């Protein structure tokens, strides 16, 4: 699944939305 192109800063990758991950620097890939 692809996650919309929306910036998102978080610690735990799980925090991310859809089927993506959260990056330490502060961005969801």
Question: What would you say this structure looks like, in words?
Answer:
Belongs to the protease inhibitor I7 (squash-type serine protease inhibitor) family. Its main location: secreted. This is Trypsin inhibitor 1. The protein is mostly beta strands and 29 residues long. It has no helices and 2 strands. It has a two-stranded antiparallel ribbon. Strand 1 and strand 2 form a beta hairpin.
The main pleated sheet reads as: 2 strands, antiparallel
Spell the H/E element sequence.
EE
Give the end-to-end Cα distance, rounded to a whole number of Å: 12 Å
**What percent of residues adopt helix (DSSP H or I)?**
under 10%
Number of strands: 2
Strand order of the biggest β-sheet: 1-2
Q: What fraction of the residues are assigned to beta strands by DSSP?
A: 5-15%
Shape: globular
Q: Structural class of the secondary structure composition?
A: mainly beta
Query: Cα-atom Rg, whole angstroms?
Result: 8 Å
The total count of helices amounts to 0
User: How many domains is the backbone divided into?
Assistant: 1
What is the structure about, briefly put?
The chain is mostly beta strands and 29 residues long. The protein has strands at 22-23, 27-28.
């Amino acid at each position: 699944r692809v996650c919309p192109r929306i910036l998102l800063e978080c610690k735990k990758d799980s925090d991310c939305l859809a089927e993506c991950v959260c990056l330490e620097h502060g961005y969801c890939g």
